[PDB]
Amino acid sequence: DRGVSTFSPEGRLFQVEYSLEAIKLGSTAIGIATKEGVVLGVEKRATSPLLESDSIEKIVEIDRHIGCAMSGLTADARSMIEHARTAAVTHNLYYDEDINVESLTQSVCDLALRFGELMSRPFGVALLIAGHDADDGYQLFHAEPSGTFYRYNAKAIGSGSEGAQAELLNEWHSSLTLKEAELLVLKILKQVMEEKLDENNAQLSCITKQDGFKIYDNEKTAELIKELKEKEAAE
């Protein structure tokens, strides 16, 4: 064997690179930023039809103005969410204000390389962190187990990501409405998912300045699926 903090001859950290492979095996998560909000959607991917799908929780609130979706070894994310929530509430306690989305993300990313021989290995989960703040408006971030984070207009992570990302490359423009973004996330999810996308095996959410972070009920998402097929049929 070989130490957990070893560089490869190409100057990359073995353990980080290997965790990136684990994330590729994860269920798909997509986020799209607009001037009206940020949408986050995920593929639930129940391993068996007896499992009650509403108990699958891959979209998560961090604060009223910050939401998060995940892909990979999702149990690894519990402590990152817990840290995120504490950092947000703590910032509001110390400063009587909302914490910036970038600042929150940087804080989560500070956990990431705290492994070695501090935790025993990197996280095997990637996160899409989405929110609003008064200074930089609507924002979407991709936080990796390398400790790197990147701002995105739109981004896919998980198994269907290289396909989905090319699709988002074509479809994203600076003037998408929230409704256009919701449909687009639904559409790209139906494309890369194994099983047939319905309201039980995929889930949507958004964050708007006005109402904060909301997870959509299954009735509400069902309609957006209905509205999406009718759009596709009609040309």
Binding site: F7, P9, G11, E117, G147, Y150, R151, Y152, K155, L169
Partner: protein, 231 residues
């Protein structure tokens, strides 16, 4: 080969392969340039993006009013090292009411990186830094490498294809070294230097990053519309 498992092992020719591999992450890094006159010192850095939908990763970090740096390699490692510098600059201020000499900043960074090359379990830092500042003996440029070697220069560059900019700066030495009392002319020379390291691509408005510090100028960073002046 058999001797690259950890930083605590010398090869039979006296090499430290884990350090050499850390040096390699710098080489895959986006290019950045440093150069200075007798009155100012400037950083230019080409930022890299993930794809067309992403931001262009910051490469320039302010350490104090009179000091800052640019990075090439692992960004989290630059954040750790820059944070240490921020603290060291800050300790010098609170305790001695004294702005930290760029030279001491260099010695402090060398010593911090060195520890991680002689003990088991840790790893070397995987990032190179260019440090500029204006202190009580004028303008300075420093090159940091995670081997711990720190070097004071008139100008330099690090990252992929930094060899072009470095030759250019080697030729241009006698010109830029006397661009005293002129901010925009030191920058333009820096932007020129970095251009000798571009391929398939050129400097745009969300792609270029510049910083300057000097005699009557706080360390300040320009991105976005404020670099358009220079393309």
């Amino acid at each position: 080969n058999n001797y690259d498992g950890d930083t605590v092992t010398f090869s039979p020719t006296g090499r430290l392969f884990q350090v050499e591999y850390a040096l390699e992450a710098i080489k895959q890094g986006s290019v950045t340039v440093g150069l200075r006159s007798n009155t100012h010192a400037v950083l230019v850095a080409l930022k890299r993006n993930a794809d067309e939908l992403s931001s262009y990763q910051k490469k320039i970090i302010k350490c104090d009013e009179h000091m800052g740096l640019s990075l090439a390699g692992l960004a989290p490692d630059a954040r750790v090292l820059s944070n240490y510098l921020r603290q060291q600059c800050n300790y010098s201020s609170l305790v001695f009411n004294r702005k930290l000499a760029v030279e001491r900043a260099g010695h402090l960074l060398c010593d911090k990186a060195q520890k991680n090359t002689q003990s088991y379990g840790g790893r070397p830092y995987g990032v190179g830094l260019l440090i500029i500042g204006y202190d009580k003996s004028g303008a300075h440029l420093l090159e940091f490498q995670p081997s711990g070697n720190v070097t004071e220069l008139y100008g330099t560059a690090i990252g992929a294809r930094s060899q072009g900019a470095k030759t250019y700066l080697e030729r241009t030495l006698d010109t830029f070294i006397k661009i005293d009392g002129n901010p925009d002319e030191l920058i333009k020379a820096g932007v020129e230097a970095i251009s000798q390291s571009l391929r398939d691509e050129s400097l745009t408005v969300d792609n270029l990053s510049i910083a300057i510090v000097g005699k009557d100028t706080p360390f300040t960073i320009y991105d976005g519309e404020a670099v358009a002046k220079y393309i």
